[PDB]
């Protein structure tokens, strides 16, 4: 679950045009895929690929581009052995899950 | 490297299938308006004209 | 396209929206005009109908 990861500031909502792909980029391929995400498709923002959260072997990252740009971006991404995860943002269910685990701990004791 | 050189091409691409059909949607509304202008000329007052014709 | 592109996207589609809205509002005017001309001509028809019926009596 990316509930502790995706942030609104980099996750573009309230815009029918832009939308943030939460790409997964290996640390060994840190600068690499950040650079190649520039020209995978048109209607794109150049090199907006920026680190969101660092894991042990890879790290989630945000790329901002137009909505129908996502289709070509993901196609050419899959061509070059790239990973794109579309984790949609909505705050209320993350809050609900946190309160669920809290109340289940309370029920446990 | 793209900068705004390609962004203008992107804008030109979009303005072909958005701006153009916005004007053509205004024009389609114009055409439908003329059509229903004719239909209104020929449905409501026409029926009332028939009513008064039968009255006559 | 981070700031200049998508802002122009929004502005162009905005303009499309107000133009389509103006088209609907001017449809409103044209329908009112249809009604106006329609009642005018049926009123004229009523006028000569009344006159010729007076002559008939």
Curated annotation (Swiss-Prot), chain A:
- Name of protein: V-type proton ATPase subunit C 1
Q: List the disulfide bonds.
A: none
Annotated gene: Atp6v1c1
Q: What stretch of the complete protein does the chain hold?
A: 165 to 273 of 382
**Job of this protein:** Subunit of the V1 complex of vacuolar(H+)-ATPase (V-ATPase), a multisubunit enzyme composed of a peripheral complex (V1) that hydrolyzes ATP and a membrane integral complex (V0) that translocates protons. V-ATPase is responsible for acidifying and maintaining the pH of intracellular compartments and in some cell types, is targeted to the plasma membrane, where it is responsible for acidifying the extracellular environment. Subunit C is necessary for the assembly of the catalytic sector of the enzyme and is likely to have a specific function in its catalytic activity.
Name the family the entry cites: Belongs to the V-ATPase C subunit family.
Naturally occurring in which organism (per UniProt): Mus musculus (Mouse)
On tissue specificity, the annotation reads: Ubiquitous. Abundant in brain, liver, kidney and testis.
Domain of life, per the record? Eukaryota
User: Whom does it interact with, and what assembly results?
Assistant: V-ATPase is a heteromultimeric enzyme made up of two complexes: the ATP-hydrolytic V1 complex and the proton translocation V0 complex. The V1 complex consists of three catalytic AB heterodimers that form a heterohexamer, three peripheral stalks each consisting of EG heterodimers, one central rotor including subunits D and F, and the regulatory subunits C and H. The proton translocation complex V0 consists of the proton transport subunit a, a ring of proteolipid subunits c9c'', rotary subunit d, subunits e and f, and the accessory subunits ATP6AP1/Ac45 and ATP6AP2/PRR.
Q: Where in the cell is it found?
A: Cytoplasmic vesicle, Secretory vesicle, Synaptic vesicle membrane; Cytoplasmic vesicle, Clathrin-coated vesicle membrane
From Swiss-Prot, chain B:
Q: Which residues carry this modification: Phosphotyrosine?
A: 55
N-acetylalanine: residues bearing it: 1
Q: Where in the cell is it found?
A: Apical cell membrane; Cytoplasmic vesicle, Secretory vesicle, Synaptic vesicle membrane; Cytoplasmic vesicle, Clathrin-coated vesicle membrane
Lineage, top-rank taxon, reads Eukaryota
- In which tissues is this gene expressed? Expressed within the midpiece of sperm tail (at protein level). Kidney; localizes to early distal nephron, encompassing thick ascending limbs and distal convoluted tubules (at protein level).
> Record's family?
Belongs to the V-ATPase E subunit family.
Q: How does the annotation summarize its subunit structure?
A: V-ATPase is a heteromultimeric enzyme made up of two complexes: the ATP-hydrolytic V1 complex and the proton translocation V0 complex. The V1 complex consists of three catalytic AB heterodimers that form a heterohexamer, three peripheral stalks each consisting of EG heterodimers, one central rotor including subunits D and F, and the regulatory subunits C and H. The proton translocation complex V0 consists of the proton transport subunit a, a ring of proteolipid subunits c9c'', rotary subunit d, subunits e and f, and the accessory subunits ATP6AP1/Ac45 and ATP6AP2/PRR.
What does the UniProt function comment say about this protein?
Answer: Subunit of the V1 complex of vacuolar(H+)-ATPase (V-ATPase), a multisubunit enzyme composed of a peripheral complex (V1) that hydrolyzes ATP and a membrane integral complex (V0) that translocates protons. V-ATPase is responsible for acidifying and maintaining the pH of intracellular compartments and in some cell types, is targeted to the plasma membrane, where it is responsible for acidifying the extracellular environment.
Query: What is this protein's record name?
Result: V-type proton ATPase subunit E 1
Read off the lineage from the record. Eukaryota, Metazoa, Chordata, Craniata, Vertebrata
- Its gene name is Atp6v1e1
Curated annotation (Swiss-Prot), chain C:
Compositionally biased spans, kind Basic and acidic residues? 33-53
Protein location:
Melanosome; Cytoplasmic vesicle, Clathrin-coated vesicle membrane
Q: Which range is the signal sequence, renumbered to this chain?
A: none
Quaternary data: V-ATPase is a heteromultimeric enzyme made up of two complexes: the ATP-hydrolytic V1 complex and the proton translocation V0 complex. The V1 complex consists of three catalytic AB heterodimers that form a heterohexamer, three peripheral stalks each consisting of EG heterodimers, one central rotor including subunits D and F, and the regulatory subunits C and H. The proton translocation complex V0 consists of the proton transport subunit a, a ring of proteolipid subunits c9c'', rotary subunit d, subunits e and f, and the accessory subunits ATP6AP1/Ac45 and ATP6AP2/PRR.
What does this chain do?
Answer: Subunit of the V1 complex of vacuolar(H+)-ATPase (V-ATPase), a multisubunit enzyme composed of a peripheral complex (V1) that hydrolyzes ATP and a membrane integral complex (V0) that translocates protons. V-ATPase is responsible for acidifying and maintaining the pH of intracellular compartments and in some cell types, is targeted to the plasma membrane, where it is responsible for acidifying the extracellular environment.
Q: Which family does it belong to?
A: Belongs to the V-ATPase G subunit family.
Q: What is this protein called?
A: V-type proton ATPase subunit G 2
């Amino acid at each position: 679950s990316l509930a502790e990861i995706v942030k609104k500031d980099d996750f573009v909502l309230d815009s029918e045009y832009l939308v943030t792909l939460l790409v997964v980029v290996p640390k060994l391929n840190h600068n690499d895929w950040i650079k190649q995400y520039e020209t995978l498709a048109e209607m794109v923002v150049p090199r907006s690929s920026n680190v969101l959260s660092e894991d042990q072997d890879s790290y989630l990252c945000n790329v901002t581009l137009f909505r129908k740009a996502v289709d070509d971006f993901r196609h050419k991404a899959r061509e070059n052995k790239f990973i794109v995860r579309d984790f949609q943002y909505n705050e209320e269910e993350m809050k609900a899950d946190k309160e669920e685990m809290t109340r289940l701990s309370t029920d446990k004791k | 490297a793209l900068s705004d050189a390609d962004v203008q091409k992107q804008i030109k691409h979009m303005m072909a299938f958005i701006e153009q059909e916005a004007n053509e949607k205004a024009e389609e509304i114009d055409a439908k308006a003329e059509e229903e202008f004719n239909i209104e000329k020929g449905r409501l007052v026409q029926t009332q004209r028939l009513k008064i014709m039968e009255y006559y | 396209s981070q700031t200049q592109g998508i802002q122009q996207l929004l502005q162009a589609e905005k303009r499309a929206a107000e133009k389509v809205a103006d088209a609907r509002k001017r449809k409103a005017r044209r329908l009112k005009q249809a009604k106006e001309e329609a009642q005018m001509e049926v009123e004229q028809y009523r006028r000569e109908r009344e006159q010729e019926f007076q002559s008939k009596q």
